[PDB]
């Protein structure tokens, strides 16, 4: 994996992590914690415009077994792991223990680790900056929304409420007669107009 | 950017994936499983059946499923909150809805899916799926067993100026700790230390 793997010098420690009050379980516990705090800092800093809800989803996606297993094979943990076979949520639990080792081997410092993770996650975060920080696209929503609730009698209008490209404020309201089915903000009036329809379709009711 | 979310015209079929969904995730799962197979088959024409099984397995697991479900705001079309098997399964029901509404002609979701997977498929074709790279190995191996007074030596045991390729052993004492072959003498030497490091028995 393109960032260099931070090293465990102490043999007795490395072996706590790859031998297989009883055995190492405190490193799984410390690693988990360090890994979830570190990842929290990194995303919070990189995505200032994301809600707490999106941050919570981003974090669960990068601390979970799929991605931690992916890291573990790109560092060949299946090979370091002195075992016997392959679900099997294990490799993520090794990886948590491992981070738990780097952390103790440094006196519980963690800046040296935050930096490695800040690189280890770069491709995953640029993936999210493109497709997840943002909302969606849907150049179609106004007619899609019209085909649920629109005739010639009463069809939905999209009335701008705050206007002007001055320092940025374009917000439009999608109203069907008297009720504001959805409101959204975008740098332009049509982008906001479509997004106002997109928010409305998130709530399909009339059967 | 990722492609937008195809539309579901039929209200009640929309509700059969979001307000409740059985039998659409059945159809959704096999559909999705196969279109991803076709896709990766075209884009990795040398990948053996073992790599293809792994590639399909990652592209279809709940993790990436659930994040397609999160990037299209499935959390918000859904009316218990929170991996997540469940969001993965609403996503399968969705692909199934898409299919029914178009009479099980799947060619036009393959195109969507190809757009939708275009990022991750480049990542796999980069040169690795689950592979290591060269390292900083000579020095970290040195840190375990090495003094200036006695330390390991990376001796060339065959040479490869274009014709064949280098193999170098990592010798210390009487014992060779690790050997490797790689296009370079550096790359072989580093990998030969990585091999010795994957086995820190003692010595």
């Amino acid at each position: 994996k393109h960032p260099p793997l931070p090293f465990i010098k102490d043999q007795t420690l490395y072996e706590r992590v790859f031998v297989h009050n009883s055995h190492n379980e405190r490193l799984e516990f410390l690693g988990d914690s360090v890994l979830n705090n570190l990842v929290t800092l990194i995303i919070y800093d990189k995505f200032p415009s994301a809600s707490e809800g999106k941050l919570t989803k981003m974090r669960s996606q990068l601390i979970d077994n799929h991605t931690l297993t992916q890291f573990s094979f790109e560092y060949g943990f299946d090979k370091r792991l002195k075992t016997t076979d392959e679900d099997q949520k294990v490799y993520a639990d090794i990886f948590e223990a491992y981070i738990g080792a780097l952390s103790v081997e440094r006196g519980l410092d963690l800046r040296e680790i935050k930096d490695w993770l800040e690189k280890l996650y770069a491709p995953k975060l640029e993936a999210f900056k493109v497709n997840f920080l943002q909302e969606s696209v849907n150049k179609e929503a106004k007619s899609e929304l019209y085909s649920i609730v629109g005739t010639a009698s009463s069809h939905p209008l999209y009335v701008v409420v705050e206007e002007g490209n001055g320092s940025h404020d374009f917000v439009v309201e999608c109203r069907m007669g008297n009720d504001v089915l959805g409101r959204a903000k975008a740098p332009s009036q049509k982008e906001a107009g479509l997004r106002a329809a997109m928010d409305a379709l998130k709530n399909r009711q009339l059967l």
Side-chain angles (χ1 to χ4, degrees), chain A residues 2-19 22-84 87-104 106-132 138 140-143 145-164 166 171-179 181-182 184-207:
Chain A
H2 258 69
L5 179 63
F7 186 79
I8 295 174
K9 308 198 85 187
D10 190 15
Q11 288 276 95
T12 76
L13 210 36
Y14 180 91
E15 277 186 350
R16 278 175 74 181
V17 167
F18 300 104
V19 61
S22 147
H23 71 330
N24 96 83
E25 45 174 39
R26 299 176 91 233
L27 294 162
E28 190 283 336
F29 160 96
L30 183 46
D32 211 307
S33 182
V34 167
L35 178 54
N36 285 59
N37 181 74
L38 292 188
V39 167
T40 294
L41 273 73
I42 294 153
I43 60 162
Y44 191 94
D45 167 295
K46 187 140 216 333
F47 303 101
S49 315
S51 79
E52 183 223 61
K54 191 175 298 94
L55 290 191
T56 293
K57 287 178 194 70
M58 268 164 151
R59 187 191 37 202
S60 96
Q61 288 292 284
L62 322 158
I63 51 99
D64 60 21
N65 290 62
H66 170 277
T67 166
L68 300 193
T69 300
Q70 199 169 24
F71 294 152
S72 310
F73 286 143
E74 305 162 63
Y75 292 118
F77 282 11
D78 52 287
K79 328 195 153 305
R80 316 189 187 279
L81 178 67
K82 289 320 145 179
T83 325
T84 44
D87 221 23
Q88 285 88 335
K89 318 90 198 165
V90 158
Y91 285 95
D93 279 309
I94 307 266
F95 188 91
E96 286 183 334
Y98 192 83
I99 274 173
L102 300 173
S103 316
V104 61
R106 296 161 166 70
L108 295 204
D109 198 273
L110 318 194
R111 188 63 190 243
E112 202 209 326
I113 308 190
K114 187 182 180 190
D115 284 319
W116 160 56
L117 286 183
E118 275 163 350
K119 318 184 288 162
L120 182 52
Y121 276 111
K124 313 225 83 77
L125 290 193
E126 204 38 40
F128 291 20
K129 192 133 180 206
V130 190
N131 310 295
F132 192 15
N138 207 346
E140 218 43 64
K142 294 194 227 209
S143 36
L145 155 64
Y146 183 104
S147 86
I148 301 174
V149 76
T151 44
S153 315
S154 51
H155 54 60
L157 300 322
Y158 296 74
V159 201
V160 194
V161 186
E162 171 90 0
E163 322 101 306
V171 296
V172 184
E173 268 190 70
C174 158
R175 291 183 217 138
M176 162 79 43
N178 37 12
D179 36 358
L181 288 186
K185 62 216 176 328
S188 100
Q189 171 189 349
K190 184 159 188 57
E191 213 194 334
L194 278 155
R195 288 186 191 281
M198 258 188 286
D199 193 28
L201 300 152
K202 302 275 189 276
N203 268 299
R204 285 197 224 179
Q205 33 74 60
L206 224 63
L207 310 93

